[PDB]
Amino acid sequence: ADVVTYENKKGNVTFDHKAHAEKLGCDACHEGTPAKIAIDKKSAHKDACKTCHKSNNGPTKCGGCHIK
Numbered sequence: 445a446d447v448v449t450y451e452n453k454k455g456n457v458t459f460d461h462k463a464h465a466e467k468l469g470c471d472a473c474h475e476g477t478p479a480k481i482a483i484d485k486k487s488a489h490k491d492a493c494k495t496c497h498k499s500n501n502g503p504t505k506c507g508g509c510h511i512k
């Protein structure tokens with residue numbers, strides 16, 4: 445993937461793989477040999493996302509992902 449996208453019922457969380465890998469670097473999320481990050485509604489709301497945001501981009505809280 446490169447620009448993973450997820451259509452939600454209350455907004456959207458257009459993810460990024462390549463566009464992100466740029467700043468991230470895989471390891472940023474994964475750790476030696478990828479596979480998955482089990483995202484849905486529990487982790488994506490944890491360190492998963494909320495962690496490497498409060499610094500760049502700007503909106504890290506509500507509105508960040510779910511385009512509001």
Ligand code: HEC
Pocket residue numbers: 450452453454457483484485488489493494497503504505506507508509510
């Ligand atoms: C305001 C603080 C928020 C509301 C309202 C919702 N979120 Fe999020 N969110 C994020 C991700 C990466 C996901 C996983 C994608 C997936 O669903 O597979 C989610 C998911 C949701 C869900 C689940 C949707 C459903 O009912 O199927 C809901 C209801 C939801 N989010 C509401 C990411 C982010 C995030 C990144 C910056 C923020 C700040 C929030 N979500 C905050 C909200």
Ligand code: HEC
Pocket residue numbers: 457458459460463464466467468472473488492493496497500501508509
């Ligand atoms: C959970 C899978 C994530 C969601 C939801 C979002 N990200 Fe990120 N993110 C990071 C940086 C350094 C930026 C700015 C630079 C860039 O991405 O190249 C972003 C940006 C966003 C955006 C806006 C993208 C844009 O160019 O406008 C959204 C919607 C977004 N992120 C949602 C960093 C990180 C990161 C650090 C390791 C992680 C794990 C994530 N982002 C994950 C999520």
Ligand code: HEC
Pocket residue numbers: 445450459460461462464465468469470471472473474478479480481482483484
């Ligand atoms: C660096 C270029 C990489 C590599 C080698 C991998 N990714 Fe990621 N990844 C992230 C998340 C949240 C998931 C799960 C998505 C969800 O369930 O919503 C993934 C998943 C993977 C896979 C498995 C999925 C598949 O494509 O079948 C693989 C093989 C993978 N990744 C490899 C998150 C990030 C991310 C932070 C948002 C960054 C940067 C990357 N991934 C980058 C990489």
Ligand SMILES: [Cr+3]
Pocket residue numbers: 489
């Ligand atoms: Cr919450």
